[PDB]
Design a protein around this ligand. Structure first.
Ligand SMILES: c1ccc(-c2c[nH]c(CCc3cnc4ccccc4n3)n2)cc1
Ligand SMILES: c1ccc(-c2c[nH]c(CCc3cnc4ccccc4n3)n2)cc1
Ligand SMILES: [Mg+2]
Ligand SMILES: [Mg+2]
Ligand SMILES: [Zn+2]
Ligand SMILES: [Zn+2]
Lengths: 321, 321
């Protein structure tokens, strides 16, 4: 789904205000109040991280505004979330400047913007339960497989392929960094992933020279960016949660309409148990994820710290404070 | 089994966030999100209850990390459990500070930390069905007697004796507070101990400077500490249960592998019956424990309150909610 000539040209003339050049470097930066700038913000981060000679200003602006277009008006898995995630990966890549190959940095920031392309606001579980055409196409990591698929289609549009100045092998390489990274955002896969990385980091056997070991780390970085609203400041964190549950509950409404009981997480009638559900989630998913990332990459510390601060706020909510 | 100097030297210089300080004092405090800070949480706890002048910093840090290194990689009875039991004691001691001697508070915090030392993840009943080495050596309270053997072995490790500077009277005295405390964590003994204290209280004959009554109160404090996952907020409690059964089921699987049927508690093909087992455990073991403890030590009331809360949560799980 292509962008207009008017859109990518409008993006070429954007310059970020100076009073946000500092803040964009903070892990806890909330893009919320700056909706008009989200695409320019991505260009900014892409230029800081990869430089202004990495992608042709024209081709890159096409890509971005097409990507924008191929995100839906779903309550959570929408354009805003793509740019929240891409950003976190920016902050992560910045604070680890000399560890990732040049091709990795390009691939990952792209992979992050594209990671939830054409999301319908329905879990993988849902699409398989009700024999959705997408579940027919891809049996496992259903939405994720589709997101990679969507990405490759946007690059194959006219003047959109931003990887034009690379060999066939370097282009083969990057479309695999992007593949693995998006497939990593399937949270079901995360659990296994983080478990092996734990084992490895302990026994001292974590080899960054190893390729399959690198994939696993990018894998956890992907999850870590995916969940990053658990690492914003409390009023930002509160608001994204409402977006998360609006989407969940909408899926459960669709399930009910068919005379089928959704799990309690997708039922509006159980609104009161959100604080507990969050605490449960922080404790079972978020903390481990960020605890391990901080181990592997010390500079990511502010992520865990912010997660711990949000954890306590939910605790306070549960306790009536 | 000794530890390495890398670990203990690090512990020495650790300092604790100002926000946690206010919250470690709470009964509901969950230590889960802070795995790195656990060894230093104990240090803080000792210093606040016993004084910064009470132990020589270096000998303590050595003790703690070697205790840590002697806890196994088992699902429940592991390092995290030790530090939680110890934190529950802390909060009980702090709320009843003058009722106990400095020697009792020293020993009880340390006895809580070392109480499951070297747990393999097999119950007393297993070892004594399957004639284990340890069961021929210790025939009653089998594992607990081993956990005390372990504590002393860590005190007898060179450079680890934190009680070196007590008088000779006090030294054999503190090791007896510790011996009794660990032994009392054998749940088999608890029901008798509980029934007795419950009797003495009702007929106004409970007397704190009667040493045998005193030892009985201490033992019950130990059980109340040992079970404290049931006093945490629901999602904390729920997550721990998983770890418990994850360990019970690993033991049933061993009996099955050997060809003998485990009790329903240790059989995973009977998960269905978990909420009803938790129901009865709360009604038969847990409530009675915190009920009687609150009668003897009224400032422990928040423990009964939280436990009743989770009893209500388990009653709701049964009822299909
Ligand atoms: C009632 C209400 C919520 C829950 C419940 C269970 N689990 C969760 C977590 C929801 C969730 C999922 N994914 C997230 C990603 C990023 C940030 C927050 C998230 N919260 N919520 C269960 C019953
Ligand atoms: C099937 C499943 C479980 C049970 C069953 C019986 N009794 C229990 C309680 C297990 C237990 C033991 N120790 C605990 C300590 C702290 C918190 C919870 C605990 N639960 N569970 C019986 C049949
Ligand atoms: Mg996704
Ligand atoms: Mg034990
Ligand atoms: Zn996402
Ligand atoms: Zn224990």
């Amino acid at each position: 789904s292509i962008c207009t000539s008017e859109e990518w040209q409008g993006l070429m003339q954007f310059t970020l205000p100076v009073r946000l050049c500092k803040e964009i470097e903070l892990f806890h930066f909330d893009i919320g109040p700056f909706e008009n700038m989200w695409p320019g913000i991505f260009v900014y981060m892409v230029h800081r991280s990869c430089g202004t000679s990495c992608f042709e200003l024209e081709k890159l602006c096409r890509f971005i505004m097409s990507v924008k277009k191929n995100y839906r008006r779903v309550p959570y898995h929408n354009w805003k979330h793509a740019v929240t995630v891409a950003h976190c990966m920016y902050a992560i890549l910045q604070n680890n400047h000399t560890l990732f190959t040049d091709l990795e940095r390009k691939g990952l920031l792209i992979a992050c913007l594209c990671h939830d392309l054409d999301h319908r606001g329905f879990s993988n579980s849902y699409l398989q339960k009700f024999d959705h055409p997408l579940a027919a196409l891809y049996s496992t990591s259903t939405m994720e497989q589709h997101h990679f698929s969507q990405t490759v289609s946007i690059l194959q549009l006219e003047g959109h392929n931003i990887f034009s100045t690379l060999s066939s092998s370097e282009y083969e390489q990057v479309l695999e960094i992007i593949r693995k990274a998006i497939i990593a955002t399937d949270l079901a896969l995360y659990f296994g992933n983080r478990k092996q990385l734990e084992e490895m980091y302990q026994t001292g056997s974590l080899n960054l020279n190893n390729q399959s070991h690198r994939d696993r780390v990018i894998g956890l970085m992907m999850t870590a960016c995916d969940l990053c609203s658990v690492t914003k400041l409390w009023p930002v964190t509160k608001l994204t949660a409402n977006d998360i549950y609006a989407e969940f509950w909408a899926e459960g409404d669709e399930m009910k309409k068919l005379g089928i009981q959704p799990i309690p997480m997708m039922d509006r009638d159980k609104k009161d148990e959100v604080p507990q559900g969050q605490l449960g989630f922080y404790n079972a998913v978020a903390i481990p994820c960020y605890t391990t990332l901080t181990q592997i990459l010390p500079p990511t510390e502010p992520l865990l710290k912010a997660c711990r601060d949000n954890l306590s706020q939910w605790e306070k909510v549960i306790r009536g404070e």
